[PDB]
Amino acid sequence: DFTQMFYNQNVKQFWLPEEIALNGDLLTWKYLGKNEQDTYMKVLAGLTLLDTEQGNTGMPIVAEHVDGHQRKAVLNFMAMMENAVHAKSYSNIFMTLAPTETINEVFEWVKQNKYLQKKAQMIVGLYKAIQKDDEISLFKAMVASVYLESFLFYSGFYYPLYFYGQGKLMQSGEIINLILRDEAIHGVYVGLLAQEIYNKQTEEKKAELREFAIDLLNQLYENELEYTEDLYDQVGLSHDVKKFIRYNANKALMNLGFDPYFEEEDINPIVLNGLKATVEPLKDDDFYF
Amino acid sequence: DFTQMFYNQNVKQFWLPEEIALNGDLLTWKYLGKNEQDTYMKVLAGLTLLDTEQGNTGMPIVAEHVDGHQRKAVLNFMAMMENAVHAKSYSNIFMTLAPTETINEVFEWVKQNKYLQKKAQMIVGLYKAIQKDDEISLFKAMVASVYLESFLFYSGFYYPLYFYGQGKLMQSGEIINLILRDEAIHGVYVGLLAQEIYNKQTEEKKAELREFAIDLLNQLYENELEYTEDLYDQVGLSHDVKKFIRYNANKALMNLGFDPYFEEEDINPIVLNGLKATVEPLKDDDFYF
Amino acid sequence: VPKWIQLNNEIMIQKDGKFQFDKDKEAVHSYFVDYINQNTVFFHNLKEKLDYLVENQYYEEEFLSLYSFEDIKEVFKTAYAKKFRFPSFMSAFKFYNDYALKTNDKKKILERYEDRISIVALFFANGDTEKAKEYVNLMINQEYQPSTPTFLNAGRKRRGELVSCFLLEVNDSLNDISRAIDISMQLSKLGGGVSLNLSKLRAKGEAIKDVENATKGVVGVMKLLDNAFRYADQMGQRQGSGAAYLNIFHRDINDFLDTKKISADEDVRVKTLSIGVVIPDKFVELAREDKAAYVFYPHTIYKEYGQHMDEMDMNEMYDKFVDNPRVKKEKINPRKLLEKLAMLRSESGYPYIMFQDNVNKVHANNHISKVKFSNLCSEVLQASQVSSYTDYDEEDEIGLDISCNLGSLNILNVMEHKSIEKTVKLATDSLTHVSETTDIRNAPAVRRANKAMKSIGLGAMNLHGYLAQNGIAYESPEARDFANTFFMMVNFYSIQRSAEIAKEKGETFDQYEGSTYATGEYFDKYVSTDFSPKYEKIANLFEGMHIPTTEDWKKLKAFVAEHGMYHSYRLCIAPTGSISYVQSSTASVMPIMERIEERTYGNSKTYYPMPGLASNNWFFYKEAYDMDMFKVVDMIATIQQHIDQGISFTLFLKDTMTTRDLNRIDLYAHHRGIKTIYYARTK
Amino acid sequence: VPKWIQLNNEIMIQKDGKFQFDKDKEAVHSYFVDYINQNTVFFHNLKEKLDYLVENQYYEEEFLSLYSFEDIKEVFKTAYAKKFRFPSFMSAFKFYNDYALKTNDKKKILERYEDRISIVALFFANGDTEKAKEYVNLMINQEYQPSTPTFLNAGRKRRGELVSCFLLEVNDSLNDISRAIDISMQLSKLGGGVSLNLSKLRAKGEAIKDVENATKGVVGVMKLLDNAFRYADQMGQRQGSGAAYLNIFHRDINDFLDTKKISADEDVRVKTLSIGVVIPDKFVELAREDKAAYVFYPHTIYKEYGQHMDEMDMNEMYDKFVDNPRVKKEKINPRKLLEKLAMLRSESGYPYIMFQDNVNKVHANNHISKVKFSNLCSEVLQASQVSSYTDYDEEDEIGLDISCNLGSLNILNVMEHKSIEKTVKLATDSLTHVSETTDIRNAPAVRRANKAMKSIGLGAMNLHGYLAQNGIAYESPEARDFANTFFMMVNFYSIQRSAEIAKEKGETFDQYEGSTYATGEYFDKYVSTDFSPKYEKIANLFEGMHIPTTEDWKKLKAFVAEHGMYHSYRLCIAPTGSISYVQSSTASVMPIMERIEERTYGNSKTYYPMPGLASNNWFFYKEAYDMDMFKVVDMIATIQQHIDQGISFTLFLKDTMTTRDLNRIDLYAHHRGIKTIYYARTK
Ligand SMILES: Nc1ncnc2c1ncn2[C@@H]1O[C@H](COP(=O)(O)OP(=O)(O)OP(=O)(O)O)[C@@H](O)[C@H]1O
Ligand SMILES: Nc1ncnc2c1ncn2[C@@H]1O[C@H](COP(=O)(O)OP(=O)(O)OP(=O)(O)O)[C@@H](O)[C@H]1O
Ligand SMILES: Cc1cn([C@H]2C[C@H](O)[C@@H](COP(=O)(O)OP(=O)(O)OP(=O)(O)O)O2)c(=O)[nH]c1=O
Ligand SMILES: [Mg+2]
Ligand SMILES: [Mg+2]
Ligand SMILES: [Mn+2]
Ligand SMILES: [Mn+2]
Ligand SMILES: [Mn+2]
Ligand SMILES: [Mn+2]
Missing domain, CATH: 3.20.70.20 (Anaerobic Ribonucleotide-triphosphate Reductase Large Chain)
Structure with a gap:
């Protein structure tokens, strides 16, 4: 009942980072403190890693196991967006704002950062555990994917949105909003596929799947807290970001058909403010007036 | 040396089925004989069936085994074009020209057809034989992929190009020309990835891989001749189609860095009208002799 | 943010459901009270200004030498007698950012609107003081x-x-x-x-x-x-x-x-x-009648007729080009x-x-x-x-x-x-x-x-x-x-x-x-x-x-x-x-x-x-x-x-x-x- | 595959552990007895060949007009008297593919090696028959x-x-x-x-x-x-x-x-x-001594000295360039x-x-x-x-x-x-x-x-x-x-x-x-x-x-x-x-x-x-x-x-x-x- 409308929405949202000129951010970037620039680079690098694995591994593997040519076409399109559009856009931002050595250093930093490695290990592990014709292993990977789309990106998204909302780094911010718009629909779509599998189960099996989903969320959440503190303490924003990730965790649960897990909190209003032509042939009557 | 350049060319060639209005083809379709309509339907179904294998297996399997983030992104983009763009385009052409019952029957026929099946299963067999961390099996699959993209499609492309060059079925011919333009670049790109593997091999292993490629080409070519007579004798075109197959076989070989196999021939003019050393610092005393 | 820019952005702020267009005028005043007058180079008299501009290779000596200094001063006075005021901030901003003469260091303004208009008028008149004043009245009336x-x-x-x-x-x-x-x-x-x-x-x-x-x-x-x-x-x-x-x-x-x-x-x-x-018109006629057209090789036409394809009337030449075997052409729709x-x-x-x-x-x-x-x-x-x-x-x-x-x-x-x-x-x-x-x-x-x-x-x-x-x-x-x-x-x-x-x-x-x-x-x-x-x-x-x-x-x-x-x-x-x-x-x-x-x-x-x-x-x-x-x-x-x-x-x-x-x-x-x-x- | 191609590929097929170099010679023979002699254009005598090449705009008639036809015949006979043979297949192949004159459609061979050498010698001599024969002997002997x-x-x-x-x-x-x-x-x-x-x-x-x-x-x-x-x-x-x-x-x-x-x-x-x-040599001297060098802006040097940077000796003017404040330069290693x-x-x-x-x-x-x-x-x-x-x-x-x-x-x-x-x-x-x-x-x-x-x-x-x-x-x-x-x-x-x-x-x-x-x-x-x-x-x-x-x-x-x-x-x-x-x-x-x-x-x-x-x-x-x-x-x-x-x-x-x-x-x-x-x- 939904794939065709997701297909149409995904293809109509198609974009490339080159559509957005980035040289306009040069001055507001220059004006940020060293702490702010450091957090910003690292935040986008963490996002780049997530999209790299979502594009290389997550979306293609889910596409392989989901039945139906149209469902596969949507998932293939989403996979392309992850690595050919999203992951690449971050390099466009880096290449504009930062010198090569700072770019090299931040990519070295992703390799050695323990929270980023842990979250990649956990998510990719679940993707690679999918067994052919085994719907339960597939469900588990789809939960992991929804948590990546709708929860894990958000510790990263906070900062570009926080600046966009203050009228700073608005070109980079425009790219990020386009990425976020895509991930929101990706999280909903994968969520609907996960619910399909969940709804086939006995009540006993469902109870176990909820346990899996909640245990996984808590484990990812605890790691994300440490990651958030590590990045944001130097810019004074860790508590604010934590509220934001809890907000988005609830959205991820909802995408999976589950009740919200965290209590509602006031999000920084700045971040809330941060949020070819058709062809006809020529008729013989068009030549006369 | 080449992936970013191909990335650029691929993404700038992006297109969607909806851009070409198909209904005006009915004004020339109605004037074709039964044999012409039959051949066109059968050719179209042949292309559709082969392209589906490439979207579901060929491109995603190669993307899975190739190392490199940027290569995986380009390959993902190509897989997307197969599943999201090409497959929808072929379906659109069919739905415009034939009623539902006729489409189902043509696909039943082509699905049972000996020559279409022989080539489809030969290609799929090589994709299924790729082994993790075995570059020889990957190379063999890449050869199969290049043969599909740059050679096997062309016994089929001939007919839409033949009409397109005569002013018949111009809307579907425009679509086919866009598809063909994508397959050409797909073949060239996968060809470069195969040459990379080939160049890492010993001289004996190279000679063995050359023998594999020529032997495979021979098997496919002999089946193409039979496929060609089976479809094109009823419309009197087989002689010219055979010249077009050999010409495209030579292009496929050149994509794989191999010499042409067949003598140069002229093509039907109607179809033509349609168509790092180790950096070591100077240590001083290198300036004295 | 400068004061004139705030006054200009206050236009979009709607009062009584209407845009504050008049605020733009105020912006102009600010743009002249805060920026233009402060960064405009002033001289004791027009003679000193002209000498400084000529000596520092800003102006040309030839066009100014055609007039006596009294005539140039009269032209400048005619320009300034209008008391021209830019009605919108963007007019003055565009003039003083694109057309007003600035020093070599691009931090000071040497030419006002009246100065530029007077200079252009003196250049136009080529020695006629009355013609220069007519040009000044033409351009200062805009x-x-x-x-x-x-x-x-x-x-x-x-x-x-x-x-x-x-x-x-x-x-x-x-x-x-x-x-x-x-x-x-x-x-x-x-x-x-x-x-x-x-x-x-x-x-x-x-x-x-x-x-x-x-x-x-x-x-x-x-x-x-x-x-x-x-x-x-x-x-x-x-x-x-x-x-x-x-x-x-x-x-x-x-x-x-x-x-x-x-x-x-x-x-x-x-x-x-x-x-x-x-x-x-031949292409439009061919498209109108849906007849297939021909795109021609220009050198073959030049060799056959001795003239370039674009040098002759295609309406009378198209049929002859098509019927000429020595003219090479390609079929198009x-x-x-x-x-x-x-x-x-x-x-x-x-x-x-x-x-x-x-x-x-x-x-x-x-x-x-x-x-x-x-x-x-x-x-x-x-x-x-x-x-x-x-x-x-x-x-x-x-x-x-x-x-x-x-x-x-x-x-x-x-x-x-x-x-x-x-x-x-x-x-x-x-x-x-x-x-x-x-x-x-x-x-x-x-x-x-x-x-x-x-x-x-x-x-x-x-x-x-x-x-x-x-x-x-x-x-x-x-x-x-x-x-x-x-x-x-x-x-x-x-x-x-x-x-x-x-x-x-x-x-x-x-x-x-x-x-x-x-x-x-x-x-x-x-x-x-x-x-x-x-x-x-x-x-x-x-x-x-x-x-x-x-x-x-x-x-x-x-x-x-x-x-x-x-x-x-x-x-x-x-x-x-x-x-x-x-x-x-x-x-x-x-x-x-x-x-x-x-x-x-x-x-x-x-x-x-x-x-x-x-x-x-x-x-x-x-x-x-x-x-x-x-x-x-x-x-x-x-x-x-x-x-x-x-x-x-x-x-x-x-x-x-x-x-x-x-x-x-x-x-x-x-x-x-x-x-x-x-x-x-x-x- | 052509016979000469097979004979040339027979070189690498070792016999008794040694390359078959002599097979190469056989290839040339094949390349001449199966391709070159069949694809060559023969005339009744040299007069018809020269006339055909002159009227068909293959040869310039001016350089050939400096000799009587008897002298040209003597030069061609001197070229062919050596009985020159290509010792390798690739020599003849390269000549007849890159240098031998072919027809307009490139379907036949109009020039042999001796013909090409004779034409080049006649062009070189500029009307001297003995000099043309000397050039023929120099080139046919290779x-x-x-x-x-x-x-x-x-x-x-x-x-x-x-x-x-x-x-x-x-x-x-x-x-x-x-x-x-x-x-x-x-x-x-x-x-x-x-x-x-x-x-x-x-x-x-x-x-x-x-x-x-x-x-x-x-x-x-x-x-x-x-x-x-x-x-x-x-x-x-x-x-x-x-x-x-x-x-x-x-x-x-x-x-x-x-x-x-x-x-x-x-x-x-x-x-x-x-x-x-x-x-x-100044750059090599600077690199040898590991002293940081200076690259220069040519226009500043030209303005200061009146000459281009590459117009004078850097070995004697590099220090003057470096010590000159009016010369612009950048530090390099x-x-x-x-x-x-x-x-x-x-x-x-x-x-x-x-x-x-x-x-x-x-x-x-x-x-x-x-x-x-x-x-x-x-x-x-x-x-x-x-x-x-x-x-x-x-x-x-x-x-x-x-x-x-x-x-x-x-x-x-x-x-x-x-x-x-x-x-x-x-x-x-x-x-x-x-x-x-x-x-x-x-x-x-x-x-x-x-x-x-x-x-x-x-x-x-x-x-x-x-x-x-x-x-x-x-x-x-x-x-x-x-x-x-x-x-x-x-x-x-x-x-x-x-x-x-x-x-x-x-x-x-x-x-x-x-x-x-x-x-x-x-x-x-x-x-x-x-x-x-x-x-x-x-x-x-x-x-x-x-x-x-x-x-x-x-x-x-x-x-x-x-x-x-x-x-x-x-x-x-x-x-x-x-x-x-x-x-x-x-x-x-x-x-x-x-x-x-x-x-x-x-x-x-x-x-x-x-x-x-x-x-x-x-x-x-x-x-x-x-x-x-x-x-x-x-x-x-x-x-x-x-x-x-x-x-x-x-x-x-x-x-x-x-x-x-x-x-x-x-x-x-x-x-x-x-x-x-x-x-x-x-x-
Ligand atoms: N809208 C405007 N367009 C152009 N120039 C302006 C404008 N507003 C102010 N100026 C400049 O600033 C000066 C000050 O003008 P203001 O509105 O204060 O009164 P004024 O009676 O015109 O002054 P002044 O004694 O300078 O003639 C003007 O003479 C002029 O040079
Ligand atoms: N290696 C070669 N280089 C140049 N021309 C050759 C070569 N081999 C054969 N030819 C040409 O092809 C002809 C074939 O003759 P071939 O060399 O077999 O001997 P032939 O008939 O006894 O005469 P001759 O050797 O005296 O020309 C030669 O006369 C010559 O014009
Ligand atoms: C006109 C022009 C010149 N140049 C450079 C290339 C030339 O080597 C150099 C000299 O140009 P010139 O043609 O010599 O310009 P000029 O004579 O008007 O200026 P000058 O009196 O200083 O010589 O300027 C550009 O790089 N881009 C341009 O558009
Ligand atoms: Mg000319
Ligand atoms: Mg000059
Ligand atoms: Mn993404
Ligand atoms: Mn996503
Ligand atoms: Mn395709
Ligand atoms: Mn393809």
């Missing part, structure tokens, strides 16, 4: 505005040329191609936009010295020209702008067009080279080509469309040459003769390369002063002076055609502004009636001034005797059709001004017959990009794109309402995209019937309309007599 | 080989130019840049490789008339030249090849080098224009620049390296000008004066643009015939004729330099072939002794022929009086040092030939002082790429890349063994990559001491060695007096 080159550079030693529209003919040879590249580089160095005709160049796959499949076509020449224009970019100030025009019957027309496709490869696409397509043109214009606004027969059925100088191509802005339409640039130590055959002189009447200011005649004649005199003072030593055909043709372009602007401030819709028949009458008077007084200059100097433009002015054919529609307003409102608008009748046109025809005409071309309506801001006017005769435009300068936002915009005339200031393009075509054709050259005519399309709608607009423009179509801007 | 342009195009109506390489000096102006682009396109149209010195062009960020940071630097001119060479690509047959040379002290030297980096962006990357770097050069040469084989001081310490025409750059093959090293191309309607100051005619001695055939003197003199006469009949109407500086300098290039081929076929290791001291003696003989007889031509014509080259030939300095090392072979084997190799001694050199010095020299430059050793196949010779004086080379033609593969390769001389045909590059440098320096121009010295590197090894080889070449380094080809 009735006439010299183009950006003339306004910015007149009287300045560190300057480019006063002409920025150049049309080059490229002959089918390597020597001619290299000379065209050199001339394009030299003219871009001078700051001018260069348009090159590539129709004479032989297509791809033609023979060079009887070796087959050797020519690279016009696309390689376009790549060379694009590199030349990228290299010559006004000493790294503005991006080098060039245009290439190809006839639609040239075989390369597809590859030509393929240079603007997004999917085109790096060796095919040209990025800084605009493209225009010349469409003869003209309707498919039209759809490709519409699709390309939707994607990028390219190519410019030149309706060759629409231009040449009213061209007065067809004896010299038929208009084969247009300029970078697609409004200059003049006769051009190709040059034969031979090898070294061999005499070149210098032809005619078009370079017209731009200047725009402010229709609102001209008509509220009831001074159509005086403004047109003074603008014609200033354009004649600038054309006579232009001497380009690296473009031989441009210089020869400037000396011979003496062609100028007198444009108009603030048409939509004037109509909206007078309660007239741009698409209304009353607006077209006003445009007809106003531009007929402009043409009448331009012809009268040209004939008066010819009588005074005793000379006409070269080959005038063969022109339709000499034979009196040009005045036919003027001696038989009365162009007085048909609506009472327009007649009341023209009250206080004598409207030339058929008898007046007969007298003008007799005067031209007796005395000749000094200018081969007089009127062309340029886009008028940035000078419309300084004059507080709407750009060209185009309808406004937005009622209030939002711009980003530095890290600050600014808001420019259209001139005279208020609550009462908010509805009359209809945006161009919301307008019916057929009625815009009708208005542009009404104006074009009184303009000897073309009008920069940009199409304004919505994203909803398809390529069929674009093609319909193009075909209605061709039907209505539109000479050129500039751009297809999609909202 | 003692001398005219360059590919001369051999392929002599006496042909559809010919290009006989000059292979052209060197242009580009002055620092837009007019000069545009003229350089035009001349480059004209000379690439003529088929010649064009080299341009960009060292006079001011760097990026320089002022164009008081507006600073305006110039695009040499990279913009590089892009323009790259597009020009892409457009002018010999009518699409051979890709247009250009070379850009920049002094290492130019500020743009890094950006220059960045044009060849494999990671360069499209707006900087240049792909059809070879790059060369001119390194004065010379060792880092050397490492960048080595890395670039490892990655792509670029840039060419020209050791300016090594060229100019023995340059005989420093009075005319110092050698500031080389050609596309980095072997032409001649004085050049930049031209002042002014505005249109202004006279241009025409300078000297280098251009020389190439011709190679076959060392094996010359020494086998014991005819060093006769071959050298006849080759000098042929090159003088080629220079005299060369007239380029679109390159004025090239024409003036050809008329004044009268420079020719007499190269040599089959050095390694002769050494390996005589049991001498190319790296051995005996090989260097042979090269010393042979090239001293070549220089002696070339100087003697030049002086004899000057005596017989009563004219020398322009400004000869200031040259070291006139002052006698050039002969210093020849009148004090004996260059007779130091080894008995080499002396036996030179038996039957009078090796010039110090007394003969003194007599030649007196003869030159009395009569002068006709040629400013006489000897230059070109790479001799494809014409070495026809002569059955190893390419140039370089060592062989491989013993048997596998080349793919069409869908077939062919194996070419090195000339004379066999079991007994297999290890004497040592591959270049396996050789010590230091001993190859020693050989090239030994040859270079007797060559007035440069030698195309390709470095042959292994993949294992680092950029430090490449830098060491370059520094040893500079130490040993190597003038230029051509390529860094890595195995």
